[PDB]
Amino acid sequence: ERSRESILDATERLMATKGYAATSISDIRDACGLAPSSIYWHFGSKEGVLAAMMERGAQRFFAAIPTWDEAHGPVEQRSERQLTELVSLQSQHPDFLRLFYLLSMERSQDPAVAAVVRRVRNTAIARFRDSITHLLPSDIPPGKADLVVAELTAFAVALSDGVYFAGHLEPDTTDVERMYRRLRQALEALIPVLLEET
Amino acid sequence: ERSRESILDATERLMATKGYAATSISDIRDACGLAPSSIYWHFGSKEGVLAAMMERGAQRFFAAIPTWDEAHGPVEQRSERQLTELVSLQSQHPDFLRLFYLLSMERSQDPAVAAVVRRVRNTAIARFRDSITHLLPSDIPPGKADLVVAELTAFAVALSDGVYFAGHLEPDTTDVERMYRRLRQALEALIPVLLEE
Ligand code: NA
Ligand code: NA
Ligand code: NA
C-alpha cells in the first residue's frame, strides 16, 4: 500500500526533526497529505504509527543481511559473508537501532510498540542462530548442538548490542569491524568449551 | 546535604509510580516537603534532578563492586570476586541500568543529563579496565599492554551491556552468571590472540 508508505516516510522525517513528542498527527497530515481520520484508520493511533515505522526500518536492516542460504556455498567461508554485511551496516550507525534500544528500555510501552520490539528482537536472535549453527562440527548430536548454538547465539547478540553502544557512546575511538572480528574469534574459542561442558 | 537526598528519594519513588513525564516539581514538593524554589536552587530544573538522581544510583552500583585494591586475598585473581559481585548485582537486574541505557539513547539530551551519562559510562569503562589489566602476563611492554587492555575492555563492556538487554528482553531464559562466565572465558582466549598481533 502506497498510502501506508507516505505516512511512515512523513513520520520518519518529522521525527528526525522536531522529535516524536513535538510531532502531531496534524503535522503528519501536512507532510503526507492523508487526513488524520485516514491515519487512524491505518495505524489506530500515534503510537501505532511509530510501531509500523519501527518495523519497517527493521525489515530494511535485516534484508540487507543475507541469510545463510542467500550467501553462496562457503566463500569466503560464508558466515563471514554475513559478518561483512553486518559490519557494513553497523559501521554506518543505523538510527533504526537507536530507536529499537530506546523503545525496548521504555516503561509502559504501547501494545503495538511492545509487539514490534518483541518481533524485531526475535528476528535478530533468529538471524544470528541461522548463521551460528554452521559453526559447529558435523558430528554433534542435535540436542547438544541446540544447547551450544543457543548459548553462542545469546553471546553474539549480547556483544552485537554492545557494539552499537560502543559506536554510540565512543564514536570517535570505536572500531566496529575490529570488535566484530573479536566476536568471531571469541565464538571460535568458546565452541570447544561449550561442547565439553557436562 | 540531607535536603538533596530527600528530593532524590522522592523523585525516585515518583518516577516508577507516575513516570518522569507525569511527575511535576509540585509533586516532588508534596513528597519531600521542600518548595519548588528550593528544588530549583539545588538542581536548576526538572532535568537537573533526574541527572543527580541517576548519578546517585550509579555510585551505589559501583560502590557495591570492589576495586582491585579492595577485594583482598589471595591474589586470586581478584577478578573472580569482582565478577561475582558484578554477577550478583546484574542478577537483580537493577533499574539504574535501564535508566542509563534509556538516557544514553535519546537525542536532544539536557546538558546535565549528558554529562552524567558520560561520567557513568567512563566510570564503568575505567572499572573494567582496572580489573582487566591484571589478566595479562607481566612481561608485556607497557605500550602493548595499553592496546590489549583497551581492546579487551571495550569487548567486556560491550558484552556486559548486552547481558542487561538479555536479562531485560529475555528475563525468563537468561542465565546471567553463565553469560559472564563465558565472557571471562572469552577474554582469556582472546588474550594471546591480541598479544601476538
Ligand atoms: Na517515545
Ligand atoms: Na526522559
Ligand atoms: Na569488574
Short mmCIF file of C-alpha atoms and ligand atoms in Angstrom, two decimals:
data_model
loop_
_atom_site.label_atom_id
_atom_site.label_comp_id
_atom_site.label_asym_id
_atom_site.label_seq_id
_atom_site.Cartn_x
_atom_site.Cartn_y
_atom_site.Cartn_z
CA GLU A 1 0.00 0.00 0.00
CA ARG A 2 1.45 3.33 -1.12
CA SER A 3 -0.65 5.33 1.34
CA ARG A 4 0.95 3.48 4.26
CA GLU A 5 4.44 4.33 2.99
CA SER A 6 3.84 8.07 2.70
CA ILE A 7 2.64 8.22 6.31
CA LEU A 8 5.77 6.43 7.52
CA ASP A 9 8.07 8.48 5.29
CA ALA A 10 6.46 11.63 6.67
CA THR A 11 6.78 10.37 10.24
CA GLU A 12 10.44 9.38 9.84
CA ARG A 13 11.35 12.79 8.50
CA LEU A 14 9.16 14.52 11.07
CA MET A 15 10.71 12.56 13.95
CA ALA A 16 14.20 13.07 12.55
CA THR A 17 13.43 16.74 13.03
CA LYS A 18 11.24 18.02 15.85
CA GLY A 19 11.21 14.79 17.88
CA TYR A 20 8.33 12.34 18.42
CA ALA A 21 6.69 14.36 21.20
CA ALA A 22 6.55 17.63 19.25
CA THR A 23 5.11 15.84 16.22
CA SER A 24 1.32 15.92 15.92
CA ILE A 25 -0.89 13.72 13.74
CA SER A 26 -1.80 17.07 12.17
CA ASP A 27 1.87 17.64 11.29
CA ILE A 28 1.90 14.18 9.72
CA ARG A 29 -1.13 15.10 7.62
CA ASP A 30 0.54 18.31 6.44
CA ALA A 31 3.50 16.29 5.17
CA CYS A 32 1.88 13.19 3.64
CA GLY A 33 -1.48 14.62 2.53
CA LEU A 34 -3.55 11.96 4.33
CA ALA A 35 -6.22 13.21 6.75
CA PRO A 36 -5.97 12.39 10.50
CA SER A 37 -9.02 10.11 10.18
CA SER A 38 -7.21 8.20 7.42
CA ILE A 39 -4.04 7.89 9.51
CA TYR A 40 -6.01 6.48 12.44
CA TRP A 41 -7.87 4.03 10.20
CA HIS A 42 -4.47 2.63 9.23
CA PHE A 43 -2.36 2.64 12.40
CA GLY A 44 -5.02 3.24 15.07
CA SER A 45 -3.08 5.88 17.00
CA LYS A 46 0.13 7.91 17.04
CA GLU A 47 1.92 5.07 18.81
CA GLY A 48 0.62 2.71 16.13
CA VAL A 49 2.41 4.83 13.53
CA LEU A 50 5.76 4.65 15.32
CA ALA A 51 5.22 0.90 15.69
CA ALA A 52 4.74 0.33 11.96
CA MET A 53 7.58 2.71 11.14
CA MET A 54 9.87 0.87 13.54
CA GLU A 55 9.01 -2.48 11.99
CA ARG A 56 9.75 -1.14 8.50
CA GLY A 57 13.25 0.04 9.40
CA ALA A 58 13.83 -3.45 10.80
CA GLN A 59 12.93 -5.23 7.59
CA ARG A 60 15.24 -2.94 5.60
CA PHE A 61 18.00 -3.62 8.11
CA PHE A 62 17.58 -7.40 8.01
CA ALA A 63 17.02 -7.52 4.23
CA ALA A 64 20.49 -6.05 3.77
CA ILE A 65 21.98 -9.03 5.61
CA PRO A 66 21.89 -12.26 3.61
CA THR A 67 20.55 -15.40 5.23
CA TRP A 68 22.91 -18.38 5.21
CA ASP A 69 21.09 -19.83 2.19
CA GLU A 70 21.28 -16.48 0.37
CA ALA A 71 25.04 -16.34 0.61
CA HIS A 72 26.78 -18.69 -1.73
CA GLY A 73 28.49 -22.12 -0.75
CA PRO A 74 31.11 -21.46 1.62
CA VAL A 75 33.21 -18.47 0.47
CA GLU A 76 34.93 -16.77 1.87
CA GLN A 77 33.58 -19.29 4.40
CA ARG A 78 30.04 -17.63 4.05
CA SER A 79 29.39 -17.00 7.80
CA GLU A 80 31.97 -14.35 7.03
CA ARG A 81 29.79 -13.02 4.21
CA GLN A 82 27.06 -12.29 6.72
CA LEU A 83 29.57 -10.77 9.14
CA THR A 84 30.90 -8.44 6.44
CA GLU A 85 27.39 -7.14 5.70
CA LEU A 86 26.57 -6.78 9.40
CA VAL A 87 29.80 -4.82 9.87
CA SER A 88 28.94 -2.62 6.89
CA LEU A 89 25.50 -1.68 8.24
CA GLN A 90 26.74 -1.25 11.82
CA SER A 91 29.62 0.97 10.69
CA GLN A 92 27.04 3.33 9.18
CA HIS A 93 25.49 3.60 12.65
CA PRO A 94 21.79 2.99 11.84
CA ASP A 95 19.44 5.27 13.77
CA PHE A 96 16.86 2.49 13.49
CA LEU A 97 18.81 0.64 16.18
CA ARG A 98 18.82 3.74 18.41
CA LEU A 99 15.03 3.67 18.32
CA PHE A 100 14.92 -0.07 18.99
CA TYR A 101 17.10 0.21 22.10
CA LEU A 102 15.17 3.28 23.23
CA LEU A 103 11.73 1.69 22.88
CA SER A 104 12.87 -1.59 24.43
CA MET A 105 14.03 0.33 27.51
CA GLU A 106 10.85 2.37 27.94
CA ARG A 107 8.38 1.66 30.74
CA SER A 108 4.68 1.49 29.92
CA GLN A 109 5.09 0.57 26.25
CA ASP A 110 2.14 0.86 23.88
CA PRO A 111 0.92 -2.68 22.99
CA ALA A 112 1.68 -2.16 19.29
CA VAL A 113 5.19 -0.94 20.10
CA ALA A 114 5.76 -3.83 22.51
CA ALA A 115 4.77 -6.36 19.85
CA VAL A 116 7.11 -4.79 17.28
CA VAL A 117 10.05 -4.63 19.72
CA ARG A 118 9.46 -8.29 20.60
CA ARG A 119 9.35 -9.34 16.94
CA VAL A 120 12.42 -7.36 15.87
CA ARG A 121 14.31 -8.84 18.81
CA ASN A 122 13.18 -12.37 17.93
CA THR A 123 14.13 -11.90 14.29
CA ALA A 124 17.59 -10.67 15.29
CA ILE A 125 18.16 -13.67 17.56
CA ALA A 126 16.88 -15.96 14.78
CA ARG A 127 19.20 -14.47 12.14
CA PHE A 128 22.23 -15.00 14.40
CA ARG A 129 21.18 -18.58 15.13
CA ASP A 130 20.85 -19.24 11.39
CA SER A 131 24.49 -18.23 10.96
CA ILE A 132 25.98 -19.85 14.05
CA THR A 133 24.52 -23.37 13.58
CA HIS A 134 27.01 -23.87 10.75
CA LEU A 135 29.98 -23.12 13.02
CA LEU A 136 29.61 -26.43 14.88
CA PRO A 137 31.22 -29.75 13.88
CA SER A 138 29.02 -32.05 11.78
CA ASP A 139 29.08 -34.91 14.30
CA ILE A 140 27.45 -33.17 17.29
CA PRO A 141 24.14 -34.75 18.44
CA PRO A 142 21.14 -32.46 17.63
CA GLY A 143 20.11 -31.89 21.26
CA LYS A 144 23.65 -30.93 22.24
CA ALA A 145 24.02 -28.67 19.21
CA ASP A 146 20.76 -26.91 20.15
CA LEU A 147 22.12 -26.01 23.59
CA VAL A 148 25.51 -24.89 22.32
CA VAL A 149 24.09 -22.87 19.41
CA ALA A 150 21.59 -21.16 21.73
CA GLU A 151 24.24 -20.18 24.27
CA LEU A 152 26.54 -18.99 21.48
CA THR A 153 23.70 -17.00 19.91
CA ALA A 154 22.89 -15.19 23.16
CA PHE A 155 26.58 -14.34 23.46
CA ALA A 156 26.77 -12.98 19.90
CA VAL A 157 23.55 -10.97 20.26
CA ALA A 158 24.86 -9.52 23.53
CA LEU A 159 28.21 -8.49 22.04
CA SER A 160 26.45 -7.10 18.96
CA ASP A 161 24.17 -4.98 21.16
CA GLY A 162 27.22 -3.66 23.00
CA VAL A 163 28.92 -2.80 19.72
CA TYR A 164 26.11 -0.36 18.95
CA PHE A 165 26.52 1.27 22.35
CA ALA A 166 30.26 1.49 21.75
CA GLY A 167 29.62 3.15 18.39
CA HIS A 168 27.13 5.44 20.11
CA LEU A 169 28.98 6.39 23.30
CA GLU A 170 32.52 6.14 21.89
CA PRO A 171 32.00 7.03 18.21
CA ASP A 172 35.48 8.50 17.61
CA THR A 173 37.51 5.60 19.01
CA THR A 174 35.29 2.57 18.26
CA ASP A 175 36.38 0.16 15.53
CA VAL A 176 33.27 -1.79 14.52
CA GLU A 177 34.92 -4.22 12.11
CA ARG A 178 37.59 -4.98 14.70
CA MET A 179 35.08 -5.58 17.50
CA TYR A 180 33.07 -7.98 15.36
CA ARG A 181 36.31 -9.75 14.43
CA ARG A 182 36.94 -10.35 18.12
CA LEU A 183 33.43 -11.78 18.42
CA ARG A 184 34.07 -14.28 15.62
CA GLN A 185 37.32 -15.22 17.33
CA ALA A 186 35.56 -15.45 20.69
CA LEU A 187 32.90 -17.74 19.23
CA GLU A 188 35.57 -20.00 17.73
CA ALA A 189 37.29 -20.43 21.09
CA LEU A 190 34.06 -20.98 23.02
CA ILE A 191 32.77 -23.79 20.79
CA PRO A 192 35.15 -26.43 22.19
CA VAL A 193 34.49 -25.17 25.72
CA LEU A 194 30.71 -25.49 25.38
CA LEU A 195 30.76 -28.89 23.67
CA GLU A 196 32.67 -30.50 26.53
CA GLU A 197 30.85 -28.80 29.40
CA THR A 198 28.88 -31.63 31.00
CA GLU B 1 23.26 17.53 52.47
CA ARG B 2 20.09 15.90 53.79
CA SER B 3 17.96 18.23 51.65
CA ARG B 4 19.39 16.77 48.44
CA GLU B 5 18.77 13.15 49.39
CA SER B 6 15.11 13.77 50.25
CA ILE B 7 14.48 15.32 46.84
CA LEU B 8 16.15 12.38 45.09
CA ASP B 9 14.38 9.76 47.22
CA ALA B 10 11.05 11.43 46.47
CA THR B 11 11.89 11.66 42.77
CA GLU B 12 12.97 8.00 42.78
CA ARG B 13 9.57 6.99 44.12
CA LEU B 14 7.54 9.31 41.90
CA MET B 15 9.12 8.03 38.69
CA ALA B 16 8.36 4.29 38.94
CA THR B 17 4.90 5.41 40.01
CA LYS B 18 3.67 8.09 37.60
CA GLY B 19 6.83 8.08 35.50
CA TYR B 20 9.01 11.10 34.64
CA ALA B 21 6.58 12.91 32.32
CA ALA B 22 3.59 12.68 34.67
CA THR B 23 5.68 13.85 37.63
CA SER B 24 5.79 17.57 38.42
CA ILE B 25 8.08 19.65 40.63
CA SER B 26 4.94 20.29 42.67
CA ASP B 27 4.53 16.52 43.11
CA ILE B 28 8.16 16.34 44.24
CA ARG B 29 7.46 19.12 46.74
CA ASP B 30 4.40 17.30 48.09
CA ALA B 31 6.54 14.24 48.80
CA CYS B 32 9.72 15.74 50.30
CA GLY B 33 8.27 18.93 51.82
CA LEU B 34 10.70 21.24 50.02
CA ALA B 35 9.41 24.21 47.99
CA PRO B 36 9.95 24.32 44.19
CA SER B 37 12.30 27.29 44.66
CA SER B 38 14.44 25.18 46.99
CA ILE B 39 14.44 22.30 44.50
CA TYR B 40 15.41 24.58 41.60
CA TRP B 41 18.09 26.17 43.78
CA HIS B 42 19.73 22.75 44.05
CA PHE B 43 19.32 21.12 40.64
CA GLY B 44 18.26 24.08 38.47
CA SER B 45 15.45 22.29 36.65
CA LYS B 46 13.43 19.07 36.47
CA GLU B 47 16.13 17.57 34.26
CA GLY B 48 18.76 18.59 36.79
CA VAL B 49 17.00 16.42 39.36
CA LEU B 50 16.91 13.40 37.04
CA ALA B 51 20.63 13.82 36.36
CA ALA B 52 21.67 13.94 40.03
CA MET B 53 19.24 11.11 40.78
CA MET B 54 20.70 8.58 38.38
CA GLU B 55 24.25 9.65 39.16
CA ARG B 56 23.50 8.76 42.77
CA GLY B 57 22.20 5.40 41.59
CA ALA B 58 25.47 4.88 39.71
CA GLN B 59 27.64 5.45 42.76
CA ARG B 60 25.63 2.92 44.77
CA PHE B 61 26.03 0.44 41.92
CA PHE B 62 29.79 0.93 41.65
CA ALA B 63 30.43 1.09 45.41
CA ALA B 64 28.96 -2.42 45.59
CA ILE B 65 31.66 -3.66 43.21
CA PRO B 66 35.10 -3.73 44.83
CA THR B 67 38.02 -2.14 43.01
CA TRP B 68 41.21 -4.12 42.54
CA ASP B 69 42.85 -2.84 45.74
CA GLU B 70 39.77 -3.80 47.70
CA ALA B 71 38.84 -7.49 47.29
CA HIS B 72 41.69 -8.98 49.37
CA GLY B 73 43.37 -12.39 49.48
CA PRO B 74 44.70 -14.27 47.97
CA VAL B 75 45.64 -12.51 44.88
CA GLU B 76 43.08 -14.89 43.26
CA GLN B 77 42.94 -13.41 40.72
CA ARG B 78 40.65 -10.99 42.34
CA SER B 79 38.63 -10.54 39.15
CA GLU B 80 36.65 -13.57 40.22
CA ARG B 81 35.24 -11.99 43.38
CA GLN B 82 34.97 -8.81 41.32
CA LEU B 83 33.00 -10.75 38.71
CA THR B 84 30.99 -12.46 41.45
CA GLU B 85 29.81 -9.09 42.74
CA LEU B 86 29.07 -7.86 39.20
CA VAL B 87 27.05 -11.03 38.61
CA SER B 88 25.23 -10.57 41.92
CA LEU B 89 24.13 -7.04 41.02
CA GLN B 90 23.19 -7.94 37.44
CA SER B 91 21.22 -10.94 38.73
CA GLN B 92 18.94 -8.46 40.49
CA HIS B 93 18.54 -6.60 37.18
CA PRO B 94 18.88 -3.05 38.60
CA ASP B 95 16.60 -0.34 37.22
CA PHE B 96 19.53 2.07 37.43
CA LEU B 97 20.88 0.50 34.24
CA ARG B 98 17.53 0.70 32.41
CA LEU B 99 17.58 4.43 33.08
CA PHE B 100 21.20 4.74 31.97
CA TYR B 101 20.63 2.92 28.69
CA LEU B 102 17.41 4.84 28.09
CA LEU B 103 19.01 8.23 28.66
CA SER B 104 22.08 7.21 26.65
CA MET B 105 19.78 6.56 23.72
CA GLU B 106 17.96 9.85 23.46
CA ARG B 107 18.63 12.81 21.23
CA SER B 108 18.37 16.42 22.39
CA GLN B 109 19.59 15.50 25.90
CA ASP B 110 19.62 18.08 28.68
CA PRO B 111 23.22 19.27 29.31
CA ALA B 112 23.18 17.94 32.89
CA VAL B 113 21.88 14.55 31.75
CA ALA B 114 24.52 14.26 29.03
CA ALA B 115 27.33 14.98 31.49
CA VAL B 116 26.07 12.35 33.95
CA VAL B 117 25.59 9.68 31.27
CA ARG B 118 29.14 10.29 30.03
CA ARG B 119 30.62 10.15 33.54
CA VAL B 120 28.80 6.92 34.38
CA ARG B 121 29.96 5.42 31.08
CA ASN B 122 33.58 6.49 31.69
CA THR B 123 33.48 5.15 35.24
CA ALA B 124 32.20 1.78 34.03
CA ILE B 125 34.91 1.58 31.36
CA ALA B 126 37.57 2.55 33.91
CA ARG B 127 36.39 -0.06 36.43
CA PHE B 128 36.55 -2.81 33.80
CA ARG B 129 39.99 -1.62 32.73
CA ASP B 130 41.22 -1.66 36.34
CA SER B 131 40.31 -5.34 36.60
CA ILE B 132 41.41 -6.49 33.14
CA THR B 133 44.98 -5.10 33.35
CA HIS B 134 45.78 -7.92 35.78
CA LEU B 135 44.87 -10.66 33.31
CA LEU B 136 47.97 -10.10 31.17
CA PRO B 137 51.42 -11.65 31.58
CA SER B 138 53.83 -9.32 33.40
CA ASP B 139 56.48 -9.34 30.66
CA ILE B 140 54.30 -7.43 28.18
CA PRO B 141 55.70 -3.97 27.27
CA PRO B 142 53.50 -1.18 28.76
CA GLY B 143 52.52 0.24 25.36
CA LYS B 144 51.39 -3.13 24.02
CA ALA B 145 49.57 -3.83 27.28
CA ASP B 146 47.78 -0.49 26.84
CA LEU B 147 46.33 -1.55 23.48
CA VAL B 148 45.41 -5.07 24.54
CA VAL B 149 43.72 -3.94 27.76
CA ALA B 150 41.77 -1.22 25.92
CA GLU B 151 40.51 -3.66 23.29
CA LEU B 152 39.68 -6.30 25.91
CA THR B 153 37.89 -3.66 27.98
CA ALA B 154 35.71 -2.49 25.09
CA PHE B 155 34.85 -6.13 24.43
CA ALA B 156 33.91 -6.74 28.07
CA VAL B 157 31.92 -3.52 28.34
CA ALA B 158 30.11 -4.45 25.14
CA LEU B 159 29.23 -7.96 26.35
CA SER B 160 28.20 -6.60 29.77
CA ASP B 161 25.84 -4.13 28.08
CA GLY B 162 24.37 -6.99 26.08
CA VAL B 163 23.84 -9.04 29.24
CA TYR B 164 21.49 -6.38 30.62
CA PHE B 165 19.43 -6.40 27.42
CA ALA B 166 19.28 -10.19 27.54
CA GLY B 167 18.11 -10.04 31.15
CA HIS B 168 15.63 -7.33 30.16
CA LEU B 169 14.29 -8.73 26.86
CA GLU B 170 14.68 -12.43 27.71
CA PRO B 171 14.21 -12.44 31.50
CA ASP B 172 12.82 -15.98 31.80
CA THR B 173 15.58 -17.79 29.90
CA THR B 174 18.67 -15.64 30.55
CA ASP B 175 21.32 -17.03 32.90
CA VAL B 176 23.42 -14.04 33.93
CA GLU B 177 26.15 -15.89 35.85
CA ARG B 178 26.62 -18.24 32.91
CA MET B 179 26.88 -15.35 30.44
CA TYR B 180 29.53 -13.53 32.45
CA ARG B 181 31.39 -16.83 32.80
CA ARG B 182 31.52 -17.07 29.01
CA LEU B 183 32.90 -13.54 28.96
CA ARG B 184 35.75 -14.46 31.32
CA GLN B 185 36.45 -17.48 29.14
CA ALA B 186 36.27 -15.32 26.01
CA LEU B 187 38.71 -12.78 27.43
CA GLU B 188 41.23 -15.47 28.41
CA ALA B 189 41.17 -16.96 24.92
CA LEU B 190 41.48 -13.55 23.34
CA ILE B 191 44.46 -12.61 25.47
CA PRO B 192 47.09 -14.37 23.36
CA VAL B 193 45.37 -13.62 20.06
CA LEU B 194 45.84 -9.92 20.80
CA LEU B 195 49.40 -10.12 22.14
CA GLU B 196 50.72 -11.82 19.01
CA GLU B 197 49.23 -9.01 16.93
NA NA C 1 8.57 7.52 22.84
NA NA C 2 13.11 11.10 29.83
NA NA C 3 34.54 -5.81 37.10
#
